[PDB]
Every structure is written in C-alpha cells, then in structure tokens.
Design a protein around this nucleic acid. Structure first.
Ligand code: MG
Ligand code: ZN
Ligand code: ZN
Lengths: 86, 252, 209, 54, 195, 107, 114, 97
RNA sequence: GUAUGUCUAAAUGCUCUUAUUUACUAACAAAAU
RNA sequence: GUUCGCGAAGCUUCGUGGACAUUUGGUCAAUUUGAAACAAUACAGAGAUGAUCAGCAGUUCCCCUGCAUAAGGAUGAACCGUUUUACAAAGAGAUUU
C-alpha cells in the first residue's frame, strides 16, 4: 500500500524538525556573525559566554580521523546460480 | 614544623624573579616567546634560585582558604607572592597527600593535567596511566661543573637534597649509567621533588666552584623508566600484589 | 546530538545542588586527543579550584571511568588496578599513537574489563570471586626508608643502600641515641653467622660495581 | 582532464557490466590502455582494428 | 538590563601599556584575543575615522568600548549632527581656510608620514600634560549679524545638552527658532549654494 | 534596501558580554591605542605564522629583514587580507598621526 | 615578503660602511664565501662518457655542478673555469675547462668527448 | 644571490649575526670554520661548542663511509678524513680544565 | 619564478684597492625587411 | 554606612528591632620539562623521455601559502617497490602395503 497520509505527514515533520535542527547547529558552528542529573543527584548545566575574541570552538583543530566500520551484523550478499571470447 | 616555624616566605622578590628568555636565534618571536632564525645553544641553564624549604616553607593565603595544590614556584624556589600566594608552600606532608589523593590520578600535586602518554624524553609531569614515584636524575656531571668526585659522595649529596624534599623510599646512584634513581612514597612528593630539582646545581657552599655554579647546566631530573634487572622487577610485582590485596580489602 | 557526562559520586561532591558550565568542543580528550564538550564544576560555590572533565565521554564509556577522577565508575580504582584485579580472577592496552588513539576511542567495544564493571551481574561476580580467592648506628637486615624512618620515630638523615643492605642512621645527638637504645635487624654502634655471611656477600656485590 | 577521467570511469563501468571476470583490477588497466589507443587512432585517423578485441 | 559601568580612562590606558612588551606565558590568552580581534579591526578603524574631530574642534572626547585584555578598542559613539548647523560650521571652516590661503605666502603643508618609520608612536601620556592644544579653525564672528549662533556654533556637540532646541544628550532630534536658522543659512552661503 | 531583521549590531553584542567595558576617551588617545593595538595584532599574527623576518614598521609598512630564501618566501607570503588590513591601519595612523601632531605644538 | 621587494628593513642604527667593515672582518672567519668550488646549475655541452662506469651523459643534460676559478688564465685578462659534474650512476667527479681560444671547452680528467 | 648560500652570506644577514653575537651571545659554530690551532681559545664554552661541532662532523663522516659502493676511492679518502677528525676531537679534549 | 631533500645526543686593531662580476638564477618568451 | 522605629543621658549622644544591599573570578596559575618554525653546516640534488621543458589531474591515516569552491606550492609531499596458491585435469616413470 502507498503509505498512509497521516503517517507520511508525521515522517515529514520528524525529518523536517531534525534537518532544520541540524541546519541551525551548522549555522551556530559557522564563525561568521548572523538541566541534568548524574546518578541519583540532580545537577544544573550552564553555558558561559566566552569572550568574542577568543576562538569559539577552541577544541577543534581540523584533525584527520580514521573511523572503524563497526559492522558487527553480517550482510548476506545473496545472489542466484564462452570464456575465450570475453 | 612549617605552620609554627613561620608564616612568611618571600623566596625571590618581584623586583628580580626572572628575565624572560635566553638568546638563541637572531630575532625574538613575540607569539612563542622563543628565539627564531637559528638554534645554537644547549639551552638548559642552572636555576638562580632554590628551595631551602626549612627556611622558606610557611602558611599561605591558600592554607587558610583550603587549597589542595602546592606551589610550583615555591618548589622551584621563587614564589614572589609568598604569604599572599594561593598555592601551598611546604613539602607535601602525608595528610595533605591523603586529602588530594582523589584528584592525584588526573593531575599532579601542582594541579595541572597529567597526560595519557609520557613525553618521549620522560621529561615532565608524568602520565595518569602509569602512576609513578620514581625520578631519573641525570646531567650530574654538568650539575657539578665536571667535578672529579667520588660516586659515593655524589649519592650522599643527592640523598641530602632529596630527603629534605620528600619522604624517600629508596635511592641509587650508578657509575656506569652516570645517573641517580630516586623513589618516593607518594607520587605527589616525587613530583614536587622533580619540580624543585629541575635545573638545580648539586654543589654546596663549602665547595670551591660555588661562585661559578650559574655558568654550568643544572640537574636533568626526569621520570624513571622502570629498572629491567630482575630483583627490582620482582619487588615491584610484590608491591603491586600488595596494593591489589589492599584494594580488595577496601572493597569488601 | 550529544551524550551525557559520566561523573562519579565522590568526584562531583557531597551536595544536593551543583552548577556547572558546558563548553562544547572545549578541549581535546587526554586519551584520544579529539574534541569534546568540557563540563567543569566548582563543587561547593566557594571551595577553590574547578573540576574540569579531562576525557571524552566515549573514552570514559570504553574504560568505564569517572570523567574527572579517571577511576572505575563502580569501584573507584585506577584503571590499571581495577583491570589487574579482573585479570587475576586481561587488561586494556591504550595505544599511545597520534592517529591510532583516536581510532581506538571511536570504536565502542568497552576496551577491556569495562563490560564486567558496567554490569551488576559481572562486577558482583568478580567481587565474589576475589573474596573467595582472599579467603650513630649502622643497620643490617627489602623494605623502604619511609618505613624505617617511621620505625625510628616510634622508637623515639637516615641513609640506606639496598644492594649493600647497610643503613647508617645519624641522629647527630647523644640524647636522641641514648633514649633510642633504652626504649627498645642487627643494630650496632659506629643464625648470626649466616646473617654475617649474607651481609658480606651483599657488600662484595656492592663493591664489584 | 577531469572530463577524460570521467569518461574513462564510465567506460570501465560499462565493461564491468558487460561480462564476468576474475581479478578484474588488472584488466581495468588494460581496458583503459585500449581506450586510449582507440582515441589516439581516432585523432590520427587510423582505423582502430584489434583482432582479439571482442 | 542595567547599563555598562562607565570605567575610568586611566584603567584602559594601563591595560594598553601592559600589552606593549607582551612575551610571557602570562597573557597567552591575551595574544589569542589580539589575534581574534583582527576580525573587528577594520570596524574599529571605520569607527575611529568616523569620529574624526572636525576642524572646528580642538579635541573630541569620544565613547569607547575596549576588550579588557587590551586587544581592541572601538570608538562606540556614532557622530550625528544638526544638519544645517553642520553645514554652517563647514562653510565657516571653508571661509577660514580661504582667509588663511589669502594671508600666507607659503602655507606649510605637512610631510608624510608625520612620524618616522623607526620612531614608535608616542603614547598619549607624553601630551596629556602638554599645554592647551592650539586654537582650531573657527572664523572671526560678529555680534550684529551672527548674534544667535556664535555661542554654540563651534562646539563638539553642535548644540548644547539640556536645552529646548534639541531632544537632549542623545542628540537625536532638533527644533530651531527662526533667527538662529536664518543666521545658519547666511553662514552656509558657500556650501548650500543651491538653485 | 537594508536589513529588516538585524537589530544586533556588532558593538551591542560586545557590550552584552562581560569582557568589554567602556570609557570616555580623547579621540587622539583612542587613535593612538588603535595604532598600537593594531600594530601588535599584525606583529602577533605574523609571529604566529612563523615568519619573524618580515618586520613591521610602526608606520605599518611591512618589509623583510634579510633577503628571504625561497622556502621562507613561500612560507611568508601574506595575502590580500592581511595586506589590506595593514593598509587600513597605515591610513588610520596617518590621520591619527596628523591629529597627534596638531595636538602637539608641531602644526 | 615578495620577490620584487623594493626595500629591505634595516635596524635604526645601521652605519652601512661600518656594517660592511664588520662583515669583512667576519668573512675570513666565515665558512662559506671563504672557500672554492661554489655551486652552479649547468647543462653539459660536450656530451661525453663517464670514464669509470661508462655512463653516456648526452648533450644538454642538466647538473648541479661546481664552478671553480683556474688561477692560470688564458692569455691575460679573460678567465677560465673548472666545471665539476658527477656521473648519474657512479659518483665519479667529471669536469671540464673553458679555454676560449677555440670558443669551446676542454676535458679535465673526468671523461672523454664523443 | 640565487641558491640560498648567497642569501646566507649577504651583508645584511652577516650584520645581523654580528649584532646577535654582540648582544646576548648568539653564535653559530656551524657557520664559522673551527680553528686549526687550539690554545687560542681562552673561553671554555666556545671550546665546548667547537668540540661538539667536530663530533658532529665525525658522525656525518661515519654515516656516509658505510655506503654500498665500498670499493670507490672517496670512501678510502674519508677514512683518513675520519682519522683526522678523531685526532682533532682528541686535541679538543685538552687538560687545562 | 631563484627548486629541493636527508644529516644535528643535551688573536687584536690597522689600513689600503675600485671608470667591474670567480657573480648567481633560469621556472619566463622567442621574429624580420 | 544610609536610615524608619523603641529605651536611657544632656534637638545632641550611647544602647537596641527592622528595612536597604546581599556569594566575584579561573579550560589559564611567572624560565628550562608537555612540545612553533625557518635558518645554518655537511652531504647529495631536479616527472615522462635519449635530452630539455610546459601544464593538468589522480591515490593518501602529509600538509603549507592563499579570503578562497581562485590560484600557487620540487609535475607541492609519499606513490617508481614488492610481485610463488579460489589452482585443477590427462599421460609417463619410481619406492612403500
Ligand atoms: Mg613546476
Ligand atoms: Zn607561590
Ligand atoms: Zn570521579
């Protein structure tokens, strides 16, 4: 069946929200202008306003990073079934 | 007894604490504070100051407030803040060590981040992975201005300098390697000692080369790469086992 | 998206309110040298010196450790020690290399032991197993000087070579020494035969190099 | 150059699609070479006739 | 919320002076800050230039923001004027210049650059103390014709604060009487020369 | 036709932080500060870049100390940004310098 | 910073004559400048065989040679030069001289022309 | 002044070096030739530097002389050069201090 | 477009010679009435 | 300190209850040991191809200059080497059970 209209809408919303969020994050990251708990204990997170002269994201430094594939589950690669010419 | 011994310290006054760099290179790089356009000069120079701790050690602005970490500058022997220093001025006692033994994994007795990997020269502020209390001493030839001394004498001198600085576990001078291994009880103490004795002369006033101690190159005090010969290894293993046992006891 | 900070009970403090700031890609983790969010908290408002997180959350997860203390999340023991115990009942090998460390960090395997510590099942079992397993003067005749010194103090410069086994204590006072003698492992002034022999041997060893 | 590269890639893909091979990487190079030769021939106005070419 | 603390200029000066011989591990972060500040240095330049004291002005005081690190200093205020008044002032200046030209056999034009490439530009503290800055460009007035304008015409803020002729110290709006306006118009005969 | 949205000018944002504070300053003084600060910035950046052999005059005319070897030259070719900035600074100095001169009895 | 740089920066005290004198004083001490066989890049006009390993270095082949002055000039006031080369394969020092009587070169115990 | 050597020994650079030597004591013992006759060197530091330089030279010589074309005469020549270097080093280890 | 790479343990002043240059670089470009 | 009330001495002074104002700052601590590069000496030394030379790409867990998705870096860096098995079928001869 061609998927339910409501379902489709929901999907759109989810992705739209997510993609929008991502874009916002990206924008924030770009250097041009324009509460929690640990264990049982409750803890307030804050974000301090760093000085606008110092590098915004002092962590990052354009590092090369090789990633592991981490494919634990095994893909089944299934299939079916004159050499002198070819 | 540093508390009732004195309050004051004032090791080297803020008139003359240090000149900033020593001229290698042609031009002075403002951003690194290091001379550029050339590299000729062995660079390591002897400390103008030192920690005579019995005289210096005292109450600080930190002690009152409840500071954990000891003063690097004090250790080096040049804390111009003195009584108004926020870092502690005494040889790390046991109680203090106990108090900061939670944090002592991640950072030194000076409150500064221990690293994951050792520096290739074992040169500074040891790794958090390998706990250690064991200092390589070196450049003892250079630290004594190439003096024809007995190894025994050298060893004695080392003991004198290092015992004062912290509770010793055990010490070894070596003729062949031309070195001085020291081990402490507490890592913090060891660290403090290292900080102190970096770039220090081993000479005394009674020696004839006292006035030209500055012209030499100081002690090269570094971290100890574990001794390979087997008895030592066995001892280490035993110690580790004991530690494990203790941990287990604590757990149950 | 971001995961949460893994800070231990003793790490964080004794109080029912702590305020901390997060600094996204603040510093590089010490293990992995890879950007991550620094949380840093002050414990009690007025108690000096901050407690910044030194490692990335992922790395912490892998080692199963406090992001400040660098100690086991469960048992609060240095990684070596905790791992060592497990081994006694295999340890982690952090690969100290520029590129490889990062890769290791990104892997999500819980390096070595961490899994055991994480699970109530496994940690507890290990503990149980462990429990079961458990259940002037010269001086002559290895142990540390800080113990010797302590002993001396109790009895009331202290040189001791180990290759020699020859501890020349020098109180520099006739009062301290004469108190020390009365209030009381061969201890002269400035199987006995066997001991003597051993001592001699030690001396010889010391003197050949 | 980029265009040429793209063309080469396309040709390789087509050849892959065409028929079965075992250790095809080696053969890819050969194919590329052949293509190059053909191009050269075209440029010259030589007929590019090779007997083994299926 | 609550406005910025009007700091003393002295503090700023001190900060500036500190970051001349900056080469310790102290102010590592200040160097970083300085580096960052290049971003806004052109903005700063634009600001400062915009605030240039006009030839009817000995020395302009100006609002200033500055990074506590000492890395950058923006002139903050944006210089607005009562347009006709401004025009009048300019006209007056022009007239003065013309007069000067008429007078002088040789007019000592500046040499450029004004200070040497070796010589580092004197701190402001060498010539705060110096004598009253010599008189600026404002033409000889008269009580009969230019009766109204003369008192304020050549002031930093062309019309005074706390008056009924301008909005106030924000200096955003102005309303003039007739005779003053007339005077201004008369003054501006050179520049406003319009059909 | 200008921005509908953007109220937030640069200075306002800066003010909103704790790191900036504000004074009232003589314009010549401000200019001098700019010259000095600007100069520092250009030196600092240059030193970071590693090229310590391109020396800045206090007039902002940059030029090399020795004759640079080729590698050094390659390292130390600043581009259209930095040079532009330098030029701007120079211009500022020139206007500021003239005002300084005026203030002083010199002119 | 740019190859066509008009003016190199000088310190504020740079007595040029004095500087020159100083340089001269520290030119006898100097390692380079006080030596022979100063380097040069040159193509080989002779097209010759390296006498050790018979490597046939052809005409116009480029090398980083050493040009040195021969004290014994040709005639009187027109200098002649030794131009050292190495063979590609074996590291034998080939060289040649520029005797300008014939408007050509002379081989100098390196290889043979052919 | 192509090929870098010229640049190095350009007058300005020399002047700079001299200035450095005067104020602070930056010498480049690489840059000057080591003296032939020792005992015209009253300072110790200078002597030490010279010794270091000679050691470096010796090391360099050593590194090259074990190359694969061992039968070539350059290597043989160096063997004597190496010896000379060693001798120089020995001399530098004089017993005045 | 003045290439490049490896290699590195931590005598003093004096003057006199010039109407020049043992000068070096070739990445750059190449025709006649 | 400001102050608005109470209680004692001579509107002046002490003794009190309140209101006002209320937890800054640090990812940092000042010289060698937590990591800047060029330079220098010595030694060699320049892509195909016989040689000389242009430019363009390509791969990468290499970067630099560059505002750069321009452009430029020794053809920017290292690539030029190692290279024996999804390996079976047929025939001939030989020793062991
Ligand atoms: Mg090229
Ligand atoms: Zn201190
Ligand atoms: Zn913790």
């Amino acid at each position: 069946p061609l998927p339910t209209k409501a379902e489709i809408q929901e999907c759109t919303a989810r992705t739209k929200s997510y993609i929008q969020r991502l874009v916002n994050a990206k924008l924030a990251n770009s250097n041009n202008r324009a509460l929690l708990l640990n264990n049982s204990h409750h803890i307030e997170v804050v974000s301090k306003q760093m000085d606008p002269l110092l590098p915004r994201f002092v962590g990052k430094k354009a590092r090369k990073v090789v990633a592991p594939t981490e494919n634990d589950e095994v893909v089944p690669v299934l299939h079916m079934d004159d050499p002198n010419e070819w | 007894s540093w508390r009732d011994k004195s309050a004051k310290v004032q090791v080297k006054e803020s008139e003359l604490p240090s000149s900033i760099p020593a001229q290698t290179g042609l031009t002075f790089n403002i951003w690194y504070n290091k001379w550029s356009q050339g590299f000729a000069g062995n660079t390591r120079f002897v400390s103008p100051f030192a920690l005579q701790p019995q005289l210096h050690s005292g109450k600080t602005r930190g002690d009152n407030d409840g500071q954990l970490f000891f003063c690097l500058f004090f250790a080096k022997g040049m804390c111009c803040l003195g009584p108004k220093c926020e870092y502690l001025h005494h040889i790390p006692d046991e109680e203090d060590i106990g108090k900061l033994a939670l944090r002592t994994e991640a950072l030194d007795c000076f409150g500064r981040e221990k690293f994951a990997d050792y520096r290739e020269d074992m040169g500074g502020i040891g790794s958090f992975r390998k706990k250690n209390k064991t200092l390589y001493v070196g450049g003892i030839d250079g630290a004594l201005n190439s003096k024809h001394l007995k190894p025994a004498q050298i060893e004695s001198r080392i003991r004198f300098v290092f015992s004062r600085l912290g509770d010793i576990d055990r010490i070894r001078y070596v003729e062949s390697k031309n070195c001085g291994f020291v081990k402490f009880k507490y890592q913090a103490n060891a660290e403090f000692a290292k900080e102190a004795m970096s770039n220090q002369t081993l000479l005394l006033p009674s020696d004839k080369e006292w006035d030209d101690r500055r012209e030499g190159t100081g002690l090269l005090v570094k971290w100890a790469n574990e001794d390979p010969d087997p008895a030592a290894q066995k001892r280490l293993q035993e110690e580790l086992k004991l530690e494990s046992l203790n941990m287990m006891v604590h757990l149950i | 998206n971001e995961p949460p900070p893994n800070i231990c009970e003793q790490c964080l403090g004794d109080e029912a309110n702590i305020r901390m700031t997060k600094i996204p890609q603040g510093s590089e983790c010490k293990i992995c040298t890879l950007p991550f969010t620094l949380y840093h908290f002050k414990t009690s408002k007025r108690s000096n010196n901050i407690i910044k997180t030194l490692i990335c959350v992922r790395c912490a997860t892998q080692r199963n450790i406090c992001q400040c203390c660098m100690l086991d999340s469960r048992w609060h023991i240095p990684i070596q020690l905790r791992d060592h115990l497990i081994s006694l009942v295999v340890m982690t090998e952090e690969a100290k290399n520029d590129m490889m460390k990062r890769f290791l960090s990104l892997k999500n395997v819980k390096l070595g032991g961490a899994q055991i510590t994480s699970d109530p099942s496994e940690a507890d079992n290990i503990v149980d197993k462990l429990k079961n397993i458990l259940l002037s003067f010269f001086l002559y005749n290895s142990i540390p000087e800080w113990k010797i010194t302590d002993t001396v103090s109790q009895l009331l410069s202290l040189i001791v070579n180990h290759k020699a086994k020859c501890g020349g204590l020098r109180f520099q006072s006739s009062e301290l020494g004469e108190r020390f003698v009365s209030k009381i492992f061969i201890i002269p002034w400035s199987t006995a035969e066997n001991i003597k022999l051993s001592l001699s041997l030690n001396k010889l060893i010391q003197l050949e190099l | 150059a980029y265009y040429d590269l793209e063309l080469r890639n396309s040709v390789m893909d087509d050849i892959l699609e065409m028929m079965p091979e075992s250790i095809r990487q080696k053969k890819a190079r050969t194919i590329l070479q052949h293509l190059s030769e053909a191009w050269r021939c075209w440029k010259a106005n030589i007929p590019w006739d090779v007997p083994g070419m299926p | 919320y609550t406005p910025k603390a009007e700091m003393p200029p002295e503090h700023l000066r001190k900060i500036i002076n500190t970051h001349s011989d900056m080469a310790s591990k102290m102010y590592n972060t200040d160097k970083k800050a300085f580096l960052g500040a290049l971003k806004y240095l052109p903005h700063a330049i634009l600001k400062l230039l915009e605030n240039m004291p006009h030839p009817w002005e000995q020395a302009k005081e100006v609002k200033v923001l500055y990074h506590t690190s000492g890395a950058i200093t923006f002139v903050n205020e944006t210089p607005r004027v009562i347009e006709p008044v401004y025009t009048a002032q300019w006209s007056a200046t022009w007239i003065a210049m013309r007069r000067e030209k008429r007078d002088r056999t040789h007019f000592k034009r500046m040499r450029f650059p004004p200070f040497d490439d070796d010589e580092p530009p004197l701190s402001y503290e060498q010539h705060i103390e110096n004598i009253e800055p010599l008189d600026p460009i404002n033409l000889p007035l008269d009580s009969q014709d230019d009766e109204y304008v003369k008192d304020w015409l050549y002031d930093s803020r062309p019309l005074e604060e706390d008056s009924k002729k301008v909005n106030g110290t924000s200096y955003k709006k102005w309303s003039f009487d007739l005779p003053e306006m007339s005077n201004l118009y008369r003054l501006s005969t050179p520049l406003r020369d319009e059909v | 036709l200008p921005t509908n949205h953007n109220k937030t000018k640069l200075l306002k944002s800066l003010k909103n932080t704790k790191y900036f504070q504000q004074t009232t300053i003589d314009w010549v003084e401000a200019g001098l500060q700019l010259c000095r600060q600007g100069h520092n910035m250009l030196n600092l950046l240059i030193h970071r870049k590693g090229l310590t052999y391109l020396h800045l005059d206090y007039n902002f005319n940059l030029k090399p100390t020795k004759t640079l070897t080729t590698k050094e030259r390659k390292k130390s070719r600043l581009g259209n940004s930095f040079h532009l900035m330098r030029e701007l600074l120079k211009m500022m100095k020139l206007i500021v310098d003239t005002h300084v001169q005026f203030r002083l009895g010199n002119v | 910073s740019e190859r066509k740089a008009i003016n190199k920066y000088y310190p504020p005290d740079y007595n040029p004559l004095e500087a020159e004198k100083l340089s001269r004083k520290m030119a006898k001490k100097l390692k380079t400048m006080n030596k022979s066989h100063a380097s040069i890049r040159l193509m080989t006009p002779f097209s010759m065989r390296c006498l050790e390993c018979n490597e046939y270095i052809p005409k116009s082949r480029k090398f980083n040679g050493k040009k040195e002055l021969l004290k014994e000039k040709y005639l009187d006031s027109i200098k002649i030069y030794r131009l050292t080369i190495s063979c590609p394969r074996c590291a034998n020092s080939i060289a040649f001289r520029t005797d300008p009587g014939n408007s050509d070169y002379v081989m100098e115990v390196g290889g043979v022309r052919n | 002044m192509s090929r870098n050597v010229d640049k190095a020994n350009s007058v300005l650079v020399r002047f700079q070096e001299q200035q450095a030597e005067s104020a602070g004591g930056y010498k480049d013992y690489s840059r000057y030739q080591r003296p032939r006759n020792v005992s015209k060197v009253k300072s110790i530091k200078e002597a030490n530097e010279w010794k270091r330089q000679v050691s470096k030279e010796i090391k360099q010589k050593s590194t090259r002389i074990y190359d694969p074309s061992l039968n070539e005469m350059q290597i043989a020549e160096l063997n004597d050069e190496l010896n000379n270097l060693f001798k120089e080093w020995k001399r530098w280890q004089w017993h005045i201090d």
